[PDB]
């Protein structure tokens, strides 16, 4: 908790032309932000161009993925350095799409968490169970494994910097949001677990946001819950609905 | 038969928008009269837009190191063909060893990227190559054939001509162990006979097959001379000015 | 609550029909009055029929080291539940580490074998256990829970009682590094609380949970004494006569 | 070529009770065999019992799989020793079912070929393309890879002992047999390749049998072809149809 976050993950969606316009629209409508942070994550291609429009502004730059090496022969990948030089503050790691479609495993993910922290950036670690896992009663152990694997090797001080995002796979793009009751139950669990790995202090420092079918007509009720520190917006982050959400987010 | 030679530079994960903007301008002027073939630079996504304008109207061409096969969608961290087409990218490396080995990218996955790149009017550069163990078992030809057949599957005579293949023996990637022009040529000749049966003589003669072991400024002359080697997919050397050297060498084989 | 202790021997890939016939007869007489618990021998498929007759009517019970979940079909090299049931097999080890690690046998695959074994009126012995790395990340409990939940999935109160679990910490398999009775007991207690939530008190108390690290004739006494350890899944020691020793020890904990 | 083989792969099909009867039926109807070999492959459970009924008889004992170690901690597996002691002469390795359902890779397979030869038994190496592979034009390279991987590390003398069985996956149990023309084309190819790896001598020594939907009303026409040295019978090997096949096999 302590400083909510409204993060938008555009995913594979905008052209440098569109980004420039859209970002500006946001920066105009939200130049005034009541401390709760607002992050926008455009694709690699449009990062530098968006960097400008944001430089010096309140809204912060976010990236969708990163490799764990400063440089090397890894054709197609982007290094932490390249993201830093552009002024990217947040980096999404472990997104369900990457885990599932691109077969990224926990170790791979864990090695990325550190790399993002090394260059003093904030990693957004994604966790979440699949419907099948939820039905077998593995919701918690699945989240627990991912979290433990994610933080493995981090000290109380680094762990404090990490951001967690619970995107229940059964609710990504399916339009089926988890009730605030279901969201909170897992968020709470993550918080308790977080403290058992460290201490009540770190656990309260780490921000855990909800992700998965975050629409304007359901965001209130999710941010209201005790342990949900904001959201990782998917679709809604592409339109102007990202403003109505940021608006609601100001209701606290 | 004629075929336009090609010299491509795969920077890989190496430069920042600054280092990039510099190096690129340098070249835009060094290789200014060079119009007898194509020099392609492939910077990281982060730095394409910048380099993109340093080339708008110049001779050197823009190329990406990877692409996803869809136009847009729920695919965090991926770049679409439309995103590359806006910036003015003309070439896209597809199926590179690193992606196949390290990022478990399979043939069917790669085949879709090939068709995808072609749909937007861009040029795929399909990479194929054996492993040391593979070559030791005599599987060089079947490893290459499988990859060529898979990659081209579904394409037709027309689309096939637009593809560019790049033979990159894995046992010669960054290990320094470049391939003797004999070895290179042998394989390139095969890939061309194969391409012949798959489609026809005309087609197999239109498709450029570049080499990719450890192309250095010294040995490169002993390769481009070969019969079935139409250019090179350069790694390291594409970083330094030695790239501008290679570009020189290649010019002394055309008229 | 009562629960009948169980001592099982997983010969693994070790004896021939001859060595087998010998060892078995030896036992049939040594452990002759032993009827306060169950001794189970698990020879390789090749040698089941032989050992099978050396037990027909005796006290010691027959057990297999693996099974496929179908009754018959196009599955070269596999053994069916019917094939085991004819010979008179009563126990079937399912989900052993070696099979999970070496032969890529997954949870869903193992769950089907559990149901299958139960259908023919036989007893599954589901093996669960963490890895050194897993225990170092504090994943012991979730690794075990996942495996227990997966394995039992679909079963009900009745069928669940018939299952026999065997906690076999992988970092203690053939490495000699047996587990302190503290560690063993801790986990066994968890697996039993879990089994309690999954079904109920009655059920969790009926299910035997055996230990399986490096059960030797000396340390075995410090384990069977524990509260939640109902017996042992013995590897090596099940080969020699030391097995007959362990069987002795276990007898001195019943009345 | 040189000494055809009629091999029956029961797969997962008989009880020790049934085996004893059935085998006997065969041993009675075929105690007289015009040199062409007849192998029967029952499941592990029934091996020793069938061993007796066959001991001293013409029909030979075959197994469906084996591990590559004489002994060790490999719960559920059977060693070469265990097969030998029972008098098993042939061992099927690399059967499509094992490759596909049980994920056995070429190395695994190759390590089994040697192990079977060590204890002086004859391994039956299975190879074959899937429909999809056949359509992409990979029929040959697929067979070539499997064969090369299978023989890797074998000398002219061991390689001579190896038996090859081409079971086109698209024809296993599908009831769709390959025409003799299609069968021969691949068999021929394997023979040419076999010689290029060794010499015309070894290539002619190695026996290559067809496998896949071998029924009595199509066996003749397959054994007739030049490079098909017999068959690996699946279903047909379970009934008495295994006798009509053995009967036809005698027509040469």
UniProtKB/Swiss-Prot annotation, chains B, C:
Top-level taxon in the UniProt lineage: Bacteria
Binding-site positions, substrate: 10-12, 173, 235-236
Subcellular location(s) per record: Cytoplasm
Residues at the active site: 96, 168
Annotated stretches, region: Triosephosphate isomerase: 1-255
Entry similarity comment: In the N-terminal section; belongs to the phosphoglycerate kinase family.
Assembly and binders: Monomer (PGK) and homotetramer (PGK-TIM).
Protein name from the UniProt record: Bifunctional PGK/TIM
Whole-protein residues included: 400 to 654 of 654
